[PDB]
Amino acid sequence: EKKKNQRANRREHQQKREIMRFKKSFTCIDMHTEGEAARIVTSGLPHIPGSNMAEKKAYLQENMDYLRRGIMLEPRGHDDMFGAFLFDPIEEGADLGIVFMDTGGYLNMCGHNSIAAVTAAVETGIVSVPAKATNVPVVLDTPAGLVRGTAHLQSGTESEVSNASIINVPSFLYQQDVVVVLPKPYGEVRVDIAFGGNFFAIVPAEQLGIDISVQNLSRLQEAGELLRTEINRSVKVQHPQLPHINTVDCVEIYGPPTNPEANYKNVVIFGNRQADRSPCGTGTSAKMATLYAKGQLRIGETFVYESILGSLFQGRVLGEERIPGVKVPVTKDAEEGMLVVTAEITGKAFIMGFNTMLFDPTDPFKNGFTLKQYIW
Amino acid sequence: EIMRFKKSFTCIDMHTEGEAARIVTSGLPHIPGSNMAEKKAYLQENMDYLRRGIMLEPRGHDDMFGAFLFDPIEEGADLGIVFMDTGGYLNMCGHNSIAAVTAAVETGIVSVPAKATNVPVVLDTPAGLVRGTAHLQSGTESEVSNASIINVPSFLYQQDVVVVLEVRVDIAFGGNFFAIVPAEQLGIDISVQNLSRLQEAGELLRTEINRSVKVQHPQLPHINTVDCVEIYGPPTNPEANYKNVVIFGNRQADRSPCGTGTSAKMATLYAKGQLRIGETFVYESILGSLFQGRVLGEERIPGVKVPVTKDAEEGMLVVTAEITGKAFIMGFNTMLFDPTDPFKNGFTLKQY
């Protein structure tokens, strides 16, 4: 009896250690930022060259797209998964290197994921907290530049984060009152184009004729897709100092708030008819840049943006600059130079899982799949 | 540090030819119930928020599927299992049973005796005992090449049931009740482009069927609704007899060929003389993946009738079908639920 179960358990032990022999694994911290997923890969990635984060992202995108697909798509992920790969920092001042992605492709900047990364870095001990600290800087070296994060620690704890802030890369209004003639039932609409880490078309829900609600999400997704498509066919949008960045990525649709604390509600449509569940950090930065450029938001004033789910992000414009010699369609005098703003965005991320992802060399879905169709 | 892991679950994340199976191995307290059906009823009635938090976004997604493992209760069984999805709880699931059999051997829940090449793994489910076999890759002490399950008894229940959306569907039991309907009767063929439509159609059909047609399992009284809809059509891979998609849950669509749906199809075919005992049937999914099935046996049950049974004295025909497919481990996960997370019980944006 006893020998039989002792022999049994040892065979069972042997089976277990056989598992991860000759199988690739990555370790991940699964977070969400007010409903939006962020899979942060902390170990197991192949070694990637690059003398800066933009070059690392280019390498990934050119040579190792299979990493993204397998981690983001079904069956390990799903069509609304977002994520990030952590690397050593390169740029002076940074704590962590990071490259973002989603089910469509690798990305330059992502605000909700940056908030999640700052949070996870502190809560899991990736960066040290000096004794007695109540705020912990976490500076991210991203393909879009340096993103200066702060984890705000819960009082009484050494590493529990109440919420996190990021200082985004420079944001700016790009072009104003752009008319786009969309098919019925939408008709013509007037939008702003702004950059907040990604380019956004910002448009009022009222122009589209649709109230922002979960039940209207498919209508919003289709309006968003139509608008984005027609913009990139008819309007030249390019970053005037980072020329790798040059098309309209997202459509930010805003309307009246449902929560009293918020200025506005929004939903961001991006990728292939996807919607952000969070209020969207770079989209919030872009909105604040636009409001600022129009005299509707003061430096230091708190701006609160609500998502389709009711979540809030808070932000503030910290400062502005002109860039002598550089211009965008909204800039009046190239001499004076274009107006940029520095914005901080704050929100809350939660740890939802510690994951070890496995890739069997004989799994035909080792690189994932999607069932979502691009409708052309 | 300890409170961060309070109320967490550990899972083996598997997939069976594309279809996810999140198998929860620890974290549940004791669940009252003297058999697996009762444990399922306890969960659905008192802890449904657990399913929601594990299956739905942000931890899961709208086509996620899973199971809770338990100690076996029924004599002969190795593992107890209750299945779950984005909508509720199936009494049986073929792809998840293939995954569970596979996980059991590969993670050492079940011992592999020396030199063995086939390992039995018997599952105690709410629909009854499911006898599984892991087929080991030769040379390896534990790597599973594929896994077979002998399903609970299946049967054609009722033919040509008209339903006005106006289509003719067959009702068959394969561990769940299925309505089986060819695609051309809907006017939309089976393709990833069509999937969204199919999901809606299948939702209507299931809902309509359950409002008009009484469906009751003669041996297991609690099974008394049509839970799934199987839409079938011609195959794209030469090795397959047919291609299908199954709609269920909160209108989610199966990525695998569906094990219980394959069983229900084989019972239908066999009842109609179109499939013989021991013959291999091959069903293809919307992703091009394949399951193999065989009818192993048949019986008539004297005195017991269902709508298709012409003469009760002789009795209804039931078959024992075996399904085979391949499952892979895709991760090991510890799922956490911060008490202040407003999405600790998940959410869906899926419209109505």
mmCIF file of C-alpha atoms in Angstrom, chain A residues 17-316:
data_model
loop_
_atom_site.group_PDB
_atom_site.id
_atom_site.type_symbol
_atom_site.label_atom_id
_atom_site.label_comp_id
_atom_site.label_asym_id
_atom_site.label_seq_id
_atom_site.Cartn_x
_atom_site.Cartn_y
_atom_site.Cartn_z
ATOM 1 C CA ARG A 17 9.430 18.427 -13.836
ATOM 2 C CA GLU A 18 9.083 16.958 -17.367
ATOM 3 C CA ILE A 19 6.567 19.815 -18.078
ATOM 4 C CA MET A 20 8.828 22.801 -18.576
ATOM 5 C CA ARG A 21 11.780 20.900 -20.087
ATOM 6 C CA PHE A 22 12.274 22.050 -23.735
ATOM 7 C CA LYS A 23 9.213 24.387 -23.501
ATOM 8 C CA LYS A 24 9.545 28.209 -23.697
ATOM 9 C CA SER A 25 8.055 30.190 -20.790
ATOM 10 C CA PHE A 26 7.518 33.881 -20.067
ATOM 11 C CA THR A 27 6.533 35.314 -16.742
ATOM 12 C CA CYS A 28 3.830 37.964 -16.745
ATOM 13 C CA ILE A 29 2.092 40.216 -14.245
ATOM 14 C CA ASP A 30 -1.496 40.641 -15.479
ATOM 15 C CA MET A 31 -2.900 44.055 -14.501
ATOM 16 C CA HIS A 32 -5.881 46.097 -15.439
ATOM 17 C CA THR A 33 -6.197 49.840 -15.314
ATOM 18 C CA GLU A 34 -9.868 50.579 -14.537
ATOM 19 C CA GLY A 35 -11.052 47.674 -16.709
ATOM 20 C CA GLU A 36 -8.402 47.794 -19.448
ATOM 21 C CA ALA A 37 -5.984 44.805 -19.608
ATOM 22 C CA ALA A 38 -2.257 45.153 -19.500
ATOM 23 C CA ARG A 39 -0.020 42.054 -19.603
ATOM 24 C CA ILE A 40 3.434 43.080 -18.400
ATOM 25 C CA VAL A 41 6.089 40.531 -19.434
ATOM 26 C CA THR A 42 8.809 40.486 -16.805
ATOM 27 C CA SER A 43 11.069 37.574 -17.880
ATOM 28 C CA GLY A 44 11.776 34.996 -20.531
ATOM 29 C CA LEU A 45 12.010 37.243 -23.620
ATOM 30 C CA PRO A 46 14.763 36.706 -26.138
ATOM 31 C CA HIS A 47 17.568 39.229 -26.090
ATOM 32 C CA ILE A 48 16.882 42.131 -28.412
ATOM 33 C CA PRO A 49 19.484 44.594 -29.753
ATOM 34 C CA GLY A 50 19.025 48.395 -29.913
ATOM 35 C CA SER A 51 20.830 51.499 -28.725
ATOM 36 C CA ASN A 52 17.485 53.052 -27.746
ATOM 37 C CA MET A 53 13.868 52.002 -27.197
ATOM 38 C CA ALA A 54 12.686 53.079 -30.639
ATOM 39 C CA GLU A 55 15.279 50.745 -32.181
ATOM 40 C CA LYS A 56 14.265 47.898 -29.876
ATOM 41 C CA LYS A 57 10.597 48.309 -30.873
ATOM 42 C CA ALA A 58 11.675 48.382 -34.564
ATOM 43 C CA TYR A 59 13.613 45.182 -34.055
ATOM 44 C CA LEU A 60 10.604 43.480 -32.409
ATOM 45 C CA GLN A 61 8.284 44.680 -35.090
ATOM 46 C CA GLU A 62 10.560 43.601 -37.936
ATOM 47 C CA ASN A 63 11.836 40.301 -36.600
ATOM 48 C CA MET A 64 9.857 39.046 -33.600
ATOM 49 C CA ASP A 65 6.179 39.771 -34.183
ATOM 50 C CA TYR A 66 5.493 36.158 -33.162
ATOM 51 C CA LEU A 67 6.229 37.166 -29.483
ATOM 52 C CA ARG A 68 3.422 39.694 -29.550
ATOM 53 C CA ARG A 69 0.945 37.445 -31.359
ATOM 54 C CA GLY A 70 1.406 34.550 -29.001
ATOM 55 C CA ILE A 71 1.102 36.629 -25.862
ATOM 56 C CA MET A 72 -1.756 38.942 -27.036
ATOM 57 C CA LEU A 73 -4.045 36.798 -29.206
ATOM 58 C CA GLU A 74 -6.278 33.879 -28.336
ATOM 59 C CA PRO A 75 -5.903 31.391 -26.860
ATOM 60 C CA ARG A 76 -3.504 32.994 -24.301
ATOM 61 C CA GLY A 77 -4.962 36.429 -24.786
ATOM 62 C CA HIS A 78 -7.958 37.859 -26.618
ATOM 63 C CA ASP A 79 -8.957 40.524 -29.086
ATOM 64 C CA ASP A 80 -8.892 43.373 -26.545
ATOM 65 C CA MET A 81 -5.599 42.418 -24.816
ATOM 66 C CA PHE A 82 -2.854 45.056 -24.348
ATOM 67 C CA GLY A 83 0.625 44.447 -23.043
ATOM 68 C CA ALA A 84 4.139 45.472 -22.523
ATOM 69 C CA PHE A 85 7.701 44.018 -22.555
ATOM 70 C CA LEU A 86 10.100 45.311 -19.887
ATOM 71 C CA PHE A 87 13.805 45.882 -20.746
ATOM 72 C CA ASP A 88 16.832 47.538 -19.122
ATOM 73 C CA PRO A 89 16.622 51.353 -19.303
ATOM 74 C CA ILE A 90 18.928 52.979 -21.868
ATOM 75 C CA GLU A 91 18.236 56.723 -21.758
ATOM 76 C CA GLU A 92 19.833 58.409 -18.755
ATOM 77 C CA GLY A 93 17.393 58.977 -15.890
ATOM 78 C CA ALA A 94 15.183 55.940 -16.616
ATOM 79 C CA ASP A 95 14.425 52.996 -14.339
ATOM 80 C CA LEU A 96 12.802 50.659 -16.892
ATOM 81 C CA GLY A 97 12.744 50.237 -20.632
ATOM 82 C CA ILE A 98 9.304 49.409 -22.059
ATOM 83 C CA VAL A 99 7.699 48.589 -25.420
ATOM 84 C CA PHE A 100 3.912 48.451 -25.690
ATOM 85 C CA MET A 101 1.610 46.422 -27.855
ATOM 86 C CA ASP A 102 -1.871 45.288 -28.607
ATOM 87 C CA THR A 103 -3.549 42.746 -30.895
ATOM 88 C CA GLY A 104 -2.982 45.028 -33.886
ATOM 89 C CA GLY A 105 0.773 45.710 -33.487
ATOM 90 C CA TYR A 106 3.590 47.055 -31.363
ATOM 91 C CA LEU A 107 2.967 50.645 -30.070
ATOM 92 C CA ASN A 108 5.027 53.730 -29.128
ATOM 93 C CA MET A 109 3.109 54.850 -26.035
ATOM 94 C CA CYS A 110 0.154 53.665 -24.016
ATOM 95 C CA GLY A 111 -1.059 55.587 -20.975
ATOM 96 C CA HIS A 112 -3.140 52.950 -19.192
ATOM 97 C CA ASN A 113 -0.342 50.432 -19.594
ATOM 98 C CA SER A 114 2.213 52.942 -18.319
ATOM 99 C CA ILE A 115 0.091 53.445 -15.190
ATOM 100 C CA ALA A 116 -0.068 49.665 -14.799
ATOM 101 C CA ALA A 117 3.732 49.338 -15.252
ATOM 102 C CA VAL A 118 4.534 51.988 -12.633
ATOM 103 C CA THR A 119 2.142 50.204 -10.248
ATOM 104 C CA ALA A 120 3.428 46.691 -10.879
ATOM 105 C CA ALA A 121 7.054 47.779 -10.682
ATOM 106 C CA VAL A 122 6.511 49.045 -7.146
ATOM 107 C CA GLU A 123 4.121 46.418 -5.867
ATOM 108 C CA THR A 124 6.221 43.458 -7.037
ATOM 109 C CA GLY A 125 9.618 44.907 -6.070
ATOM 110 C CA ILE A 126 11.039 45.503 -9.568
ATOM 111 C CA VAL A 127 12.109 48.983 -8.327
ATOM 112 C CA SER A 128 13.099 49.550 -4.674
ATOM 113 C CA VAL A 129 11.178 51.842 -2.366
ATOM 114 C CA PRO A 130 13.534 53.898 -0.144
ATOM 115 C CA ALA A 131 12.572 53.819 3.580
ATOM 116 C CA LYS A 132 9.780 56.138 4.712
ATOM 117 C CA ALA A 133 8.885 57.104 1.119
ATOM 118 C CA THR A 134 5.255 57.950 0.305
ATOM 119 C CA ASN A 135 5.871 58.560 -3.421
ATOM 120 C CA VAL A 136 8.075 56.515 -5.665
ATOM 121 C CA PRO A 137 9.304 57.721 -9.031
ATOM 122 C CA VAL A 138 9.400 55.152 -11.830
ATOM 123 C CA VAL A 139 10.822 56.612 -14.992
ATOM 124 C CA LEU A 140 9.999 54.700 -18.211
ATOM 125 C CA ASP A 141 12.208 54.755 -21.313
ATOM 126 C CA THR A 142 9.624 54.297 -24.110
ATOM 127 C CA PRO A 143 9.871 54.395 -27.891
ATOM 128 C CA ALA A 144 8.053 57.797 -27.682
ATOM 129 C CA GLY A 145 10.506 59.240 -25.115
ATOM 130 C CA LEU A 146 10.821 59.430 -21.368
ATOM 131 C CA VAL A 147 7.636 58.986 -19.316
ATOM 132 C CA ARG A 148 8.135 60.094 -15.721
ATOM 133 C CA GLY A 149 5.893 58.058 -13.484
ATOM 134 C CA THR A 150 5.066 58.305 -9.804
ATOM 135 C CA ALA A 151 3.556 55.626 -7.621
ATOM 136 C CA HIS A 152 1.557 57.109 -4.734
ATOM 137 C CA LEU A 153 1.934 54.634 -1.840
ATOM 138 C CA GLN A 154 -0.874 53.710 0.476
ATOM 139 C CA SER A 155 -0.110 55.144 3.931
ATOM 140 C CA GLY A 156 1.082 52.499 6.375
ATOM 141 C CA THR A 157 2.491 50.245 3.631
ATOM 142 C CA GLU A 158 5.986 49.786 2.181
ATOM 143 C CA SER A 159 4.820 48.949 -1.357
ATOM 144 C CA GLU A 160 1.031 49.035 -1.819
ATOM 145 C CA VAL A 161 0.108 51.636 -4.450
ATOM 146 C CA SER A 162 -3.069 53.756 -4.107
ATOM 147 C CA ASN A 163 -2.672 55.111 -7.610
ATOM 148 C CA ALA A 164 -0.076 56.207 -10.123
ATOM 149 C CA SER A 165 0.713 59.255 -12.194
ATOM 150 C CA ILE A 166 2.487 59.656 -15.440
ATOM 151 C CA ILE A 167 3.969 62.697 -17.051
ATOM 152 C CA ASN A 168 3.393 62.103 -20.664
ATOM 153 C CA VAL A 169 5.626 62.979 -23.559
ATOM 154 C CA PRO A 170 4.890 66.360 -25.121
ATOM 155 C CA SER A 171 1.324 66.736 -26.346
ATOM 156 C CA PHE A 172 -0.100 69.227 -28.775
ATOM 157 C CA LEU A 173 -3.005 70.290 -30.938
ATOM 158 C CA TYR A 174 -2.113 69.511 -34.569
ATOM 159 C CA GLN A 175 -5.030 70.750 -36.685
ATOM 160 C CA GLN A 176 -8.379 72.295 -35.925
ATOM 161 C CA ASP A 177 -11.906 72.234 -37.394
ATOM 162 C CA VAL A 178 -11.245 69.458 -39.905
ATOM 163 C CA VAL A 179 -14.375 68.639 -41.927
ATOM 164 C CA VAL A 180 -14.962 64.989 -42.790
ATOM 165 C CA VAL A 181 -17.911 63.897 -44.879
ATOM 166 C CA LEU A 182 -19.032 60.525 -43.589
ATOM 167 C CA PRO A 183 -21.707 58.210 -45.008
ATOM 168 C CA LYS A 184 -25.263 58.311 -43.694
ATOM 169 C CA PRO A 185 -26.409 58.155 -40.945
ATOM 170 C CA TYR A 186 -23.378 60.176 -39.779
ATOM 171 C CA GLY A 187 -23.000 62.899 -42.422
ATOM 172 C CA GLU A 188 -20.343 65.576 -42.152
ATOM 173 C CA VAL A 189 -18.506 66.165 -38.877
ATOM 174 C CA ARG A 190 -15.873 68.621 -37.584
ATOM 175 C CA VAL A 191 -12.923 67.230 -35.614
ATOM 176 C CA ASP A 192 -9.664 68.269 -33.997
ATOM 177 C CA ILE A 193 -6.410 66.383 -34.527
ATOM 178 C CA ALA A 194 -4.088 66.186 -31.508
ATOM 179 C CA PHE A 195 -1.028 64.227 -30.386
ATOM 180 C CA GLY A 196 -0.741 62.866 -26.853
ATOM 181 C CA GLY A 197 1.691 60.007 -27.423
ATOM 182 C CA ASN A 198 -0.395 58.723 -30.321
ATOM 183 C CA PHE A 199 -2.392 60.849 -32.824
ATOM 184 C CA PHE A 200 -6.088 61.231 -32.114
ATOM 185 C CA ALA A 201 -9.081 62.622 -33.978
ATOM 186 C CA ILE A 202 -11.247 64.183 -31.276
ATOM 187 C CA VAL A 203 -14.980 64.470 -32.128
ATOM 188 C CA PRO A 204 -18.164 65.199 -30.167
ATOM 189 C CA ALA A 205 -20.671 62.352 -29.875
ATOM 190 C CA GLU A 206 -23.399 64.897 -30.637
ATOM 191 C CA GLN A 207 -22.045 65.380 -34.176
ATOM 192 C CA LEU A 208 -22.377 61.674 -34.884
ATOM 193 C CA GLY A 209 -25.912 61.564 -33.484
ATOM 194 C CA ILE A 210 -25.137 58.784 -30.973
ATOM 195 C CA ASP A 211 -25.191 58.957 -27.170
ATOM 196 C CA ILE A 212 -22.081 57.385 -25.556
ATOM 197 C CA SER A 213 -23.315 54.221 -23.823
ATOM 198 C CA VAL A 214 -22.454 50.530 -23.721
ATOM 199 C CA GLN A 215 -25.541 49.699 -25.788
ATOM 200 C CA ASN A 216 -24.336 52.112 -28.498
ATOM 201 C CA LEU A 217 -20.842 50.635 -28.571
ATOM 202 C CA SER A 218 -21.090 48.905 -31.949
ATOM 203 C CA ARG A 219 -22.427 52.149 -33.550
ATOM 204 C CA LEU A 220 -19.612 54.098 -31.917
ATOM 205 C CA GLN A 221 -17.087 51.496 -33.053
ATOM 206 C CA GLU A 222 -18.297 51.766 -36.658
ATOM 207 C CA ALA A 223 -18.426 55.585 -36.652
ATOM 208 C CA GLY A 224 -14.935 55.563 -35.140
ATOM 209 C CA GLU A 225 -13.611 53.208 -37.848
ATOM 210 C CA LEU A 226 -15.261 55.144 -40.703
ATOM 211 C CA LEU A 227 -13.912 58.448 -39.381
ATOM 212 C CA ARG A 228 -10.379 57.166 -38.882
ATOM 213 C CA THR A 229 -10.287 55.626 -42.377
ATOM 214 C CA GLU A 230 -11.511 58.765 -44.118
ATOM 215 C CA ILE A 231 -9.065 60.946 -42.131
ATOM 216 C CA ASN A 232 -5.982 58.963 -43.114
ATOM 217 C CA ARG A 233 -6.994 59.034 -46.817
ATOM 218 C CA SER A 234 -7.629 62.786 -46.958
ATOM 219 C CA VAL A 235 -5.452 64.500 -44.295
ATOM 220 C CA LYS A 236 -1.678 64.584 -43.926
ATOM 221 C CA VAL A 237 -0.878 63.845 -40.284
ATOM 222 C CA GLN A 238 2.757 63.516 -39.295
ATOM 223 C CA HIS A 239 4.779 64.244 -36.190
ATOM 224 C CA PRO A 240 7.160 67.125 -37.149
ATOM 225 C CA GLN A 241 10.137 65.969 -35.004
ATOM 226 C CA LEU A 242 9.612 62.167 -34.708
ATOM 227 C CA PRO A 243 8.996 61.262 -38.368
ATOM 228 C CA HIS A 244 8.476 57.521 -37.674
ATOM 229 C CA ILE A 245 5.161 58.657 -36.056
ATOM 230 C CA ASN A 246 2.741 59.647 -38.827
ATOM 231 C CA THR A 247 -0.915 58.606 -39.126
ATOM 232 C CA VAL A 248 -4.203 59.012 -37.096
ATOM 233 C CA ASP A 249 -4.251 55.946 -34.738
ATOM 234 C CA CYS A 250 -7.406 56.670 -32.628
ATOM 235 C CA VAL A 251 -10.758 58.437 -32.629
ATOM 236 C CA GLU A 252 -11.761 59.984 -29.330
ATOM 237 C CA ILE A 253 -15.567 60.463 -29.090
ATOM 238 C CA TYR A 254 -16.692 62.626 -26.156
ATOM 239 C CA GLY A 255 -19.935 63.836 -24.613
ATOM 240 C CA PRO A 256 -21.545 64.938 -21.356
ATOM 241 C CA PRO A 257 -20.483 63.249 -18.148
ATOM 242 C CA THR A 258 -22.684 60.767 -16.278
ATOM 243 C CA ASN A 259 -20.563 61.068 -13.155
ATOM 244 C CA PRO A 260 -20.673 64.461 -11.371
ATOM 245 C CA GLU A 261 -16.917 64.406 -10.691
ATOM 246 C CA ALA A 262 -16.063 64.328 -14.432
ATOM 247 C CA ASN A 263 -15.810 67.069 -17.042
ATOM 248 C CA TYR A 264 -16.653 64.734 -19.907
ATOM 249 C CA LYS A 265 -17.173 61.116 -20.799
ATOM 250 C CA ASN A 266 -15.326 59.548 -23.725
ATOM 251 C CA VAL A 267 -14.661 56.351 -25.616
ATOM 252 C CA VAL A 268 -11.628 55.848 -27.754
ATOM 253 C CA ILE A 269 -11.962 53.692 -30.881
ATOM 254 C CA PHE A 270 -8.781 52.265 -32.231
ATOM 255 C CA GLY A 271 -7.235 49.286 -34.034
ATOM 256 C CA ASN A 272 -9.818 47.110 -35.686
ATOM 257 C CA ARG A 273 -13.085 48.514 -34.384
ATOM 258 C CA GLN A 274 -11.804 48.182 -30.786
ATOM 259 C CA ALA A 275 -12.887 50.361 -27.866
ATOM 260 C CA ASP A 276 -10.747 51.321 -24.816
ATOM 261 C CA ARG A 277 -12.456 50.366 -21.546
ATOM 262 C CA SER A 278 -10.449 52.991 -19.632
ATOM 263 C CA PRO A 279 -10.651 56.756 -20.225
ATOM 264 C CA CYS A 280 -7.357 56.443 -22.277
ATOM 265 C CA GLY A 281 -4.285 58.223 -20.995
ATOM 266 C CA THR A 282 -2.701 59.503 -24.203
ATOM 267 C CA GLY A 283 -6.251 60.441 -25.396
ATOM 268 C CA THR A 284 -6.717 62.394 -22.136
ATOM 269 C CA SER A 285 -3.386 64.129 -22.687
ATOM 270 C CA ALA A 286 -4.433 64.940 -26.269
ATOM 271 C CA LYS A 287 -7.798 66.378 -25.076
ATOM 272 C CA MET A 288 -6.088 68.527 -22.437
ATOM 273 C CA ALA A 289 -3.654 69.830 -25.069
ATOM 274 C CA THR A 290 -6.580 70.799 -27.273
ATOM 275 C CA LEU A 291 -8.530 72.476 -24.411
ATOM 276 C CA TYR A 292 -5.392 74.269 -23.367
ATOM 277 C CA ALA A 293 -4.610 75.472 -26.865
ATOM 278 C CA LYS A 294 -8.147 76.907 -26.971
ATOM 279 C CA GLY A 295 -7.979 78.725 -23.620
ATOM 280 C CA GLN A 296 -10.448 76.308 -22.003
ATOM 281 C CA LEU A 297 -8.052 74.782 -19.453
ATOM 282 C CA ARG A 298 -5.626 76.467 -17.172
ATOM 283 C CA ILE A 299 -2.239 75.156 -16.128
ATOM 284 C CA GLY A 300 -2.660 73.248 -12.883
ATOM 285 C CA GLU A 301 -6.413 72.870 -13.196
ATOM 286 C CA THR A 302 -7.763 69.373 -12.627
ATOM 287 C CA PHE A 303 -9.439 67.772 -15.609
ATOM 288 C CA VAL A 304 -11.479 64.570 -15.085
ATOM 289 C CA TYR A 305 -12.326 62.197 -17.903
ATOM 290 C CA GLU A 306 -14.841 59.374 -17.588
ATOM 291 C CA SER A 307 -14.805 56.120 -19.603
ATOM 292 C CA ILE A 308 -17.727 54.165 -21.072
ATOM 293 C CA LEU A 309 -17.625 51.957 -17.909
ATOM 294 C CA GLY A 310 -17.705 54.916 -15.504
ATOM 295 C CA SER A 311 -14.008 54.838 -14.592
ATOM 296 C CA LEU A 312 -12.112 58.124 -14.047
ATOM 297 C CA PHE A 313 -8.702 59.433 -14.842
ATOM 298 C CA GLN A 314 -7.632 62.832 -13.532
ATOM 299 C CA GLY A 315 -5.176 65.055 -15.263
ATOM 300 C CA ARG A 316 -3.422 68.405 -15.147
#
